[PDB]
Amino acid sequence: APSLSNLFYDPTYNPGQSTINYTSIYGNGSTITFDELQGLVNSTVTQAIMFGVRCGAAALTLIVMWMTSRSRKTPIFIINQVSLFLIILHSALYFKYLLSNYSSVTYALTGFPQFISRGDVHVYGATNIIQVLLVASIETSLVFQIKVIFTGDNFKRIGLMLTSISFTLGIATVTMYFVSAVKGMIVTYNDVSATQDKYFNASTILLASSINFMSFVLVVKLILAIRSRRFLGLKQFDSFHILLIMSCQSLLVPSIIFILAYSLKPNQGTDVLTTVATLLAVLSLPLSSMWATAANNAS
């Protein structure tokens, strides 16, 4: 401590509007303010909290489902039980990504391609392959729940066609995710500082569409379970409607978060919303799968 400056005695001095000087690819003359630097740092600090919550939740959901189940060997159980595992693997390679040189303040401010090695591109590839192997599990789970809802003593007209639109939506979502992934990889392998992003913002809309369709079909099943019982002389539900509708026996909360995630402009946390809604969908599949295979009028 040789000597303090005079600005130490200024009550109204504002650090954050001060100047930072650095050398970039455009020479030794780039400048930035401390608040744009802090805005770059606060978005990494905000995207690590979410994925740590995801890893925690999914690990403690996997164990609890292993310990609290009566009827194992069911396909729906196995698919629900590997989706929670691909969530944890996706979150692991993203923590690997978040501490690497592709997410550094060095690359961000100074766009030098010498800072990117081979090994940073292979974890990007691997993460883009686990993201599509997770969407495929979600879609196959939804198509088995739909295939178990209406098949049976119910009318075969509606039931046979709703599995068709759900198989169609699932295969289209998976194919579009695969296309997006394989082109992004080509682009990145050609140039490290290149971005290809027109196919990620329609894959999310089709995942959202398929979840909204599952919510519609479960609401349909509930209205027909309140309509069939009154025709006969059997007693109705006392306070089961509130549990089914409100708690996520039907996928209404993830569906609302999805419809507010892409309708709203990006400046209102649109990236914080899809990440919460994918977690809530994968966490709500065990609860949507108990109502789906339940006696409509036998009980």
Partner: peptide
């Protein structure tokens, strides 16, 4: 349109 990815940011 609503989600923008960084040059090295993978899908989420």
């Amino acid at each position: 349109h609503a989600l923008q990815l960084k040059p090295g940011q993978p899908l989420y």
